[PDB]
Structure formats: structure tokens, C-alpha cells
């Protein structure tokens, strides 16, 4: 998250911190995800597309910190790593950039809702907030494009939903942005999701309800003028989410 603010998982308790175990045992942060049900973390396929082996993944819920334990955090293996079969990613856009991680602790349990572990409502289908709506994005992604490190501390920021019209403008993303994506950016482009925020939630309040409107998917750079964050428009993937979480 470029700019925005540090936060803790209490402020995004559906936020799933998804890591990959490497051969050699190193565990790197992959992406955010959002707990959309106790067993289901939704994230971005691109986060996993190159390493689709579920066994490599560790999902934490209740994690406010990237490389240290957060009290009450839950560690999950990924029982199912469901990538969107229509995922595509050239050039820039990541299409159908949505992934489901069925999470299962070593105790065979899903997320146990706690102060730090909560699900995020999926939007009702094709029900997204209007452009200009401020939504939050959360992640452990880079705080600066040029950063090598991810923040240790979860961050959130607020970006405003950008209309598809605005976002497909050539000087934005042209046709890279689809209706299955939501662009969001800061008006000053000063804050944004960034690398490592992928998969994470774009949460809007569709009034009254914190709603997983978007999944951090892609963008050119981060907090780059005319380059919004692009989010998988979750409300356009409910059938897919439904058909895969049943």
C-alpha cells in the first residue's frame, strides 16, 4: 500500500496474508486475500498462477504483521487453491484475477471468527459502489513502488473507485481494464495498492456493509498518475466464487 496508513488486522480482519513456502523452506509473502467465508480466502489468481501448488501456501488470518506473528493469528494451509481458469495476464491486465483459497489449519479447521479474523461480505452481483466511492485496500504490499521490502505492518488506504470509462481511457489503461475489473485510485494518486497488495481486499461500504468490492489485481506501477489500481471486480465473479465455494 502506497501511502495510506498502517493498520492492524482488526481493521481488516478478513485480510488474509498469503505466503508461499519455497523449496528450501523460505516463506515469502505472496499476496493478500480476503476471508469471504471461514474456509475461503479470496485472492487474485495472479498471486498463485506461477506457483499453483496449494501445498506451498500458507494463509494467515488475523495477521497484522508480515513477518512476525500477530497474536490470535491463524495459520492455514491451502486445502484448495482455486485459480480462475479464465485468468489471463498479458499485457498488463490481469483478467479474472481471482483466486479462492480454501484454507484449512493443521487442525483441519477453517477460520474461526475472532476480533482479528472476520469474513468480508461479498458484494451482491454487479452491485458495486458508484465511481468516486472511497474504498479501502489493505495489504502488506510495497509502501513505495521502489521499495524492496514489504511493510512489516499491514497497511490500508483508501482509493476511490474510478469509472470504467475513466479507467479505460488510453492514458489510464485503455481496454486493459474490463468490466470485470474495478479501477480505484487516489485522486492525487498518492496512495494505492502496490506490489504485494495483490489479492488483497478492496473493501467498499456498499452502504451498510463492508463489501469485498475488489481484489487487488494489477496496475501499472503504484500510485502512478493515471494508473489506477485495478481490482478484480468481485461482484462480477459471484457465480465463479459461488461455483467454487459450494
Amino acid at each position: 500500500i502506497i501511502g495510506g496508513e498502517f493498520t492492524t488486522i482488526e481493521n481488516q480482519p478478513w485480510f488474509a496474508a498469503i505466503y508461499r513456502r519455497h523449496r528450501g523452506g523460505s516463506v515469502t509473502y505472496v499476496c493478500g486475500g480476503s476471508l469471504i467465508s471461514p474456509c475461503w480466502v479470496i485472492s487474485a489468481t495472479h498471486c498463485f498462477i506461477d506457483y499453483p501448488k496449494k501445498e506451498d501456501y500458507i494463509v494467515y488470518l488475523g495477521r497484522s504483521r508480515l513477518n512476525s506473528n500477530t497474536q490470535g493469528e491463524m495459520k492455514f494451509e491451502v486445502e484448495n487453491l482455486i485459480l480462475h481458469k479464465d485468468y489471463s495476464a498479458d499485457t498488463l491486465a490481469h483478467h479474472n484475477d481471482i483466486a479462492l483459497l480454501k484454507i484449512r489449519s493443521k487442525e483441519g479447521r477453517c477460520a474461526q471468527p475472532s476480533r482479528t479474523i472476520q469474513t468480508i461480505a461479498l458484494p451482491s452481483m454487479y452491485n458495486d459502489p458508484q465511481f468516486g466511492t472511497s474504498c479501502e485496500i489493505t495489504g502488506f504490499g510495497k509502501e513505495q513502488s521502489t521499495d524492496y521490502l514489504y511493510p512489516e505492518q499491514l497497511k490500508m488506504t483508501v482509493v476511490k473507485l474510478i469509472s470504467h470509462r475513466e479507467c479505460q481511457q488510453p492514458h489510464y489503461y485503455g481496454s486493459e481494464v474490463t468490466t470485470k475489473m474495478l479501477c480505484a485510485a487516489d485522486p492525487q494518486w498518492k496512495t494505492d495498492s502496490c506490489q504485494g497488495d495483490s489479492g488483497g481486499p478492496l473493501v467498499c461500504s456498499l452502504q451498510g456493509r463492508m463489501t469485498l468490492t475488489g481484489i487487488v489485481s494489477w496496475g501499472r506501477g503504484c500510485a502512478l498518475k493515471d494508473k489506477p489500481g485495478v481490482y478484480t471486480r468481485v461482484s462480477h465473479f459471484l457465480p465463479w466464487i459461488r461455483s467454487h465455494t459450494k
Binding site: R20, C31, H46, F48, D50, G141, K142, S217, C222
Partner: peptide, 12 residues
């Protein structure tokens, strides 16, 4: 690769 979309990518 320094971009969202290439997290956890083989290259990158």
C-alpha cells in the same frame, strides 16, 4: 515485476 500482478511469479 515490481508491479502488482507479478507477485509470486517465477521470473520476477
Amino acid at each position: 515485476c515490481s508491479w502488482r500482478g507479478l507477485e509470486n511469479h517465477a521470473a520476477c
